[PDB]
Design an enzyme around this catalytic site. Structure first.
Site: not given
Ligand SMILES: NC(=O)c1ccc[n+]([C@@H]2O[C@H](COP(=O)([O-])OP(=O)(O)OC[C@H]3O[C@@H](n4cnc5c(N)ncnc54)[C@H](O)[C@@H]3O)[C@@H](O)[C@H]2O)c1
Ligand SMILES: COc1cc(/C=C/c2ccc(O)cc2)cc(OC)c1
Ligand SMILES: NC(=O)c1ccc[n+]([C@@H]2O[C@H](COP(=O)([O-])OP(=O)(O)OC[C@H]3O[C@@H](n4cnc5c(N)ncnc54)[C@H](O)[C@@H]3O)[C@@H](O)[C@H]2O)c1
Ligand SMILES: COc1cc(/C=C/c2ccc(O)cc2)cc(OC)c1
Lengths: 363, 363
Positions: B207, B230, B251, B264, B268-269, B296, B328
């Protein structure tokens, strides 16, 4: 913090920017019925128990709803708004956002102020006005309104607040229940602590609404008669009140004659020139030895970092946002206005409750 | 002495519901340019001097503007955000909200965190995201989002946040500047306090954006090769960087091979199953004795009422509002994920700054 003191400065900066999270989280916990369950509970309850009791409906995603409420309550626990205990689970738990241990929660004393029922000595009605989205959105337009020298609310909605209510019945209800909630509590506390109704023949309540304040006052001073003075449209909606004449009018033209005039949460809506006009009419309407009784917060002469002072300046900013040039005043400022209006150098102040004082000026 | 208690409790309830006023007043003082005047001033200045220095434009109602800014600053002074001194006016005044006496204001140390370019490094872009209208509105729909088990964000705008940003370029810019701002402060703090980059041949930054984090890291560890990994669309807009390979990818598929992988503010997302999938890829990408480095916040395993723990739970609710199942985690939870993914019972934690830890897991 890593000491640094730089680190604590940084975290302090973030706390200041995030101060909305607590109010908004408490609002959610109230709306969900979780708060009422905390207030009626015999012991600490888990999020799972709190959701099952607050919510009748079958939920599409019951486990997710439970972990989210856990997260809400855990945050409120870090701010001391609820008590939290943690216990080990014999097995594994799907309705906690941690899978060693279950958290259970109980209401802190302060939470009684958020009760929907009881004897309704709560501030919930005033709280849902404070956290009403329509009113909250004004707070985003402070900058532009300062530059124009206008009220943020009027820069957000294009008319004054009282006019806007006329076009928005649901907000108008939220507003009136808040004002009535506040007036109820202050009137009871006023009757407990204030002695300046004794001996009055006639009390004029300017902004008296349906005349409930005069009723409750007369409940205690049976020989006292009241004049409920309020706008002709507000007078019209009022049921008859034994001992009380409902009179319609603007306080800017005239105030009915009496031994005392009651101004509750009136002068803080208005700038000095308007407040001197209201008080001059108060003057002309009283006999000598007659008084104005002002029910208002009073800001300290300097910005102290206490709970009371913060509350007061926060109400000041709410007046800024709401009305622009409406404001909270010090005792000195209230005095100056009363003197400009002709009242004598004879000032009384009685503390009532929740930062409200009854200030008395004598003709 | 139980009137005192009832009164204190009532005021504490009002403080709790009114905690949005501070953030919103800070925003106004910043947006008006008053905060930067405070930050570069030699001495305490009056609202009138602050408005004259901060506003170039001619103003329709300059006295009103001045008294409004005075009221904002007085309130921030009650919260210890600025220092206030009061002096008698030997003249004629209507540019403070009291005529007897002028208040003058100076920045408290915490205000350097609100610099545009006033004083140094700052968290202003992050705070402009925090107090952005679009993001804040979501907090009003927590109740319904909980009931449906959804992100409040999704319940307010009808889709997830990353989706929505694609359709809102101004907000997408606000979001990206906040993350760049925070990434920049933390990278610098990481190079002051963290020693886990030493001896690495190849560091993969998942990322990594335009690759600034590796550049600054290489700026200190010259023999280190970076891989900036990324999304393909983010890798397109990146100017070359000496010693850093820009690799587009996701990823969830694969991570490039390395001695260490840096995550980094990624885990947490995502919920547990997504975090374990990311970390299993991290695993396969590393040689034995290689490391994942997680940057984190870390929540305490119980809700302590300290500045740090409140900060962390505040970020957890931000993740709840933004993503729903973003959260978190405690150290134990990060450990459970890493061991699920194949990492050893071998755990390191180094505190960095503003609640961020670098946790490291080894293969
Ligand atoms: N909970 C899950 O893991 C979940 C849910 C649905 C599908 N899937 C499966 O896992 C994959 C996720 O779906 P997709 O095709 O939308 O994947 P994607 O590559 O779009 O990843 C989803 C999100 O992860 C982040 N991301 C991924 N790789 C990154 C990188 N190198 N750097 C920074 N951010 C990065 C981005 O914010 C992106 O929107 C697929 O292969 C699918 O089959 C997983
Ligand atoms: C992907 O990491 C993120 C961090 C944050 C952090 C926000 C935040 C809010 C209040 C604070 O005191 C510190 C950080 C928010 C996000 O989406 C809106 C994404
Ligand atoms: N400094 C000032 O801004 C200022 C000063 C003096 C007079 N005013 C008055 O403000 C008016 C605004 O015009 P409008 O047509 O909207 O008002 P209006 O014709 O309704 O005038 C009566 C005013 O009384 C106020 N009021 C509030 N509570 C009241 C109560 N309990 N009893 C009686 N009156 C009550 C109303 O808000 C209203 O503005 C001007 O005509 C002027 O008379 C304003
Ligand atoms: C006319 O009197 C008013 C009182 C108030 C009081 C609000 C308030 C806000 C926070 C508190 O802690 C107590 C009261 C608001 C008003 O317009 C929005 C008008």
């Amino acid at each position: 913090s890593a000491r640094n003191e730089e680190d604590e400065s940084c975290m302090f900066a973030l706390k200041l920017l995030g101060g909305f999270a607590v109010p908004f989280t408490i609002k959610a916990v109230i709306e969900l019925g979780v708060m009422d369950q905390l207030l009626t509970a015999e012991r600490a309850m888990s999020a799972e128990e709190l959701v099952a009791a607050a919510v009748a409906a079958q939920l599409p995603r019951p486990e997710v709803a439970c972990t989210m409420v856990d997260r809400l309550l855990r945050f409120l626990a870090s701010h001391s708004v609820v008590r939290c205990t943690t216990e080990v689970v014999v097995g594994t738990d799907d309705a906690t956002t941690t899978t060693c241990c279950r958290r259970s929660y109980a209401a802190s004393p302060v939470c009684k102020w958020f009760a929907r029922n009881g004897v309704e000595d709560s501030v919930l009605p005033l709280g849902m006005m404070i956290l009403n989205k329509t009113f909250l959105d004004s707070w985003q337009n402070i900058t532009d309104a300062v530059l124009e020298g206008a009220a943020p609310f009027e820069k957000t909605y294009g008319m004054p607040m009282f006019e806007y209510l006329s076009t928005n019945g649901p907000l108008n209800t939220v507003f009136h229940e808040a004002m009535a909630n506040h007036s109820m509590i202050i009137t009871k506390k006023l009757l407990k602590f204030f002695r300046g109704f004794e001996g009055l023949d006639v009390l004029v309540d300017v902004g008296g609404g349906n005349g409930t304040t005069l009723q409750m006052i007369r409940g205690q001073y049976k020989n006292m008669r009241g004049i409920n003075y309020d706008l002709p449209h507000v007078i019209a909606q009022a049921a008859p009140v034994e001992g009380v004449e409902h009179v319609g009018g603007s306080m800017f033209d005239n105030i009915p004659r009496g031994n005392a005039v009651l101004l509750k949460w009136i002068l803080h809506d208005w700038d000095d020139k308007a407040c001197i006009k209201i008080l001059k009419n108060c003057y002309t309407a009283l006999h000598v030895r007659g008084k104005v009784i002002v029910l208002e917060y009073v800001v300290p002469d300097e910005p102290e970092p206490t709970l009371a002072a913060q509350g007061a300046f926060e109400l000041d900013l709410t007046m800024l946002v709401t009305f622009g040039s409406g404001k909270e005043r010090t005792q000195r400022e209230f005095s100056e206005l009363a003197m400009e209006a002709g009242f004598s150098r004879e000032f009384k102040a009685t503390y009532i409750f929740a930062n409200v004082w009854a200030l008395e000026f004598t003709k």
